[PDB]
Write a protein of this length. Structure first.
Lengths: 116, 107, 212
């Protein structure tokens, strides 16, 4: 009965910002950290990093540094993803995930569309 | 970084076939593998806990076997309700990397 | 001459305060036990925030993101399985007490998922006897500030101490010296509290290796 509810699609411009929220209801939010998983357009899946929902210190993969920052508000049980200094392949689908007994438990899809 | 690959990137089986999907790894992962079944336009649900344990709510037709640097996912008998893109992802250590993705088609 | 750091885990659930308004004594007994259990969990969490250097090194390996879920994956159907750490160190892993299984399955459905009505005093005493070990583990950890010696019965019983002797990387003649001297291999053992993360309480037990 663990549920991870995410935001909806957004349509932005190169240089704008996108604010994606991920609300985790069904467990004590402090225990499990939040993992973010970017899907490339048509390609496989990428793993950026995790944000610890107890302390708040994020860690990123070597490919996802410079423009991506994780944040959360532990009182509201939500996880935030802000993308700044946008470009034209940041497009795709973004997931928030937590550890199950082994593999991940995935949220829904918040498609990000970059126009011109 | 342990990098994973899948040999049958494009698989097209019939309605009663027994197929095998395999992965390799640049490094050694001790029986730490899971398989995701991403439907087209939805979220990927896992099927296997560790490389030899089907997940709860997953049909027993799905089964995996292997350890070290060679794994395999086996479908006992395909059914029309199961079609999508399959990814195998190690969780031994960070960063986690997924496979190339096997698009199980229908013959 | 050498230690052998095992990992002992307990499945600890987290239950919010039950909004039951019950005047029955059996409901109040279970509520008192649950308030003692939640206070034990809270006090255990409050603790975390030389012969122990070999057990602290495993406490910090479990501090990494992606090491406690692998320990859960291995025990997912076995009470005693061997796992691999990030350093390649093989550490025996043991699951002694399943308090999450009892609380989520037997207590919560008839207390908080619906209006409270408990029909049995047997489950009140049965909960009191299994939750009792958790309260004792907290009492030896809070007094001793996380490091307990000599190794007690509550941490590791005699039945589950001979299991981590026949499963050790030693000869069959060194498992004869330690299986016949259980009361001496308990005064030379330790117990280090490691973490309460992802609904799992884990502590490390350092049984000695007698190579001479």
């Amino acid at each position: 009965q663990i549920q991870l509810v995410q935001s909806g699609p957004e349509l932005k411009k190169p240089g704008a910002s996108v604010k994606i929220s991920c609300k985790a209801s069904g467990y004590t939010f402090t225990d499990y950290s939040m993992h973010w998983l970017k899907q490339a357009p048509g390609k496989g899946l990428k793993w950026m990093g995790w944000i610890t929902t107890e302390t708040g210190e994020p860690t990123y993969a070597d490919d996802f540094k410079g423009r991506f920052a994780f944040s959360l508000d532990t009182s509201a049980s939500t996880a935030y993803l802000q993308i700044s200094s946008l470009k034209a392949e940041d497009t795709g689908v973004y997931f928030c995930a937590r550890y199950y007994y082994g593999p991940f438990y995935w949220g829904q899809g918040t498609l990000v569309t970059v126009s011109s | 970084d342990i990098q994973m690959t899948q040999s049958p990137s494009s698989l097209s089986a019939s309605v009663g076939d027994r197929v095998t999907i395999t992965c390799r790894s640049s490094g050694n992962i001790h029986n730490f593998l899971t398989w995701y079944q991403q439907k087209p336009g939805k979220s990927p649900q896992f099927l296997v806990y560790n490389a030899k344990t089907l997940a709860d709510g997953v049909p027993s037709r799905f089964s995996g076997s292997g350890s070290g640097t060679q794994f395999t996912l086996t479908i006992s008998s395909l059914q029309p309700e199961d079609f999508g893109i399959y990814y195998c992802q190690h969780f031994w250590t960070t960063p986690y990397t997924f496979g190339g993705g096997t698009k199980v088609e229908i013959k | 001459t050498g230690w052998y750091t095992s990992v002992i885990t307990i499945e600890l659930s987290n239950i919010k305060e039950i909004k039951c308004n019950g005047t029955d004594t059996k409901v109040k007994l279970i509520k008192q036990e649950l308030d003692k259990y939640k206070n034990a969990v809270t006090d255990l969490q409050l603790l975390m925030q030389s012969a122990i250097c070999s057990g602290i090194a495993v406490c910090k390996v479990l501090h990494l993101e992606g090491e406690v879920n692998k320990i859960k994956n291995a025990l997912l159907s076995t009470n005693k399985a061997v796992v691999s750490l990030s350093n390649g160190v093989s550490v025996l892993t043991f699951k002694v007490l399943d308090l999450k299984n009892y609380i989520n399955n037997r207590l919560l459905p008839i207390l908080n998922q619906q209006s409270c009505r408990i029909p049995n005093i047997e489950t009140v005493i049965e909960f009191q006897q299994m939750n009792s070990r958790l309260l004792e583990i907290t009492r030896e950890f809070s007094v001793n500030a996380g490091v307990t010696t000599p190794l007690s019965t509550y941490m590791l019983t005699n039945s589950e101490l001979l299991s981590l002797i026949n499963d050790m990387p030693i000869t069959n003649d060194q498992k004869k010296l330690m299986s016949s001297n259980v009361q001496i291999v308990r005064q030379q053992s330790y117990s280090i509290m490691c973490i309460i993360k992802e609904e799992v309480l884990a502590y490390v037990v350092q049984l000695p290796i007698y190579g001479v």
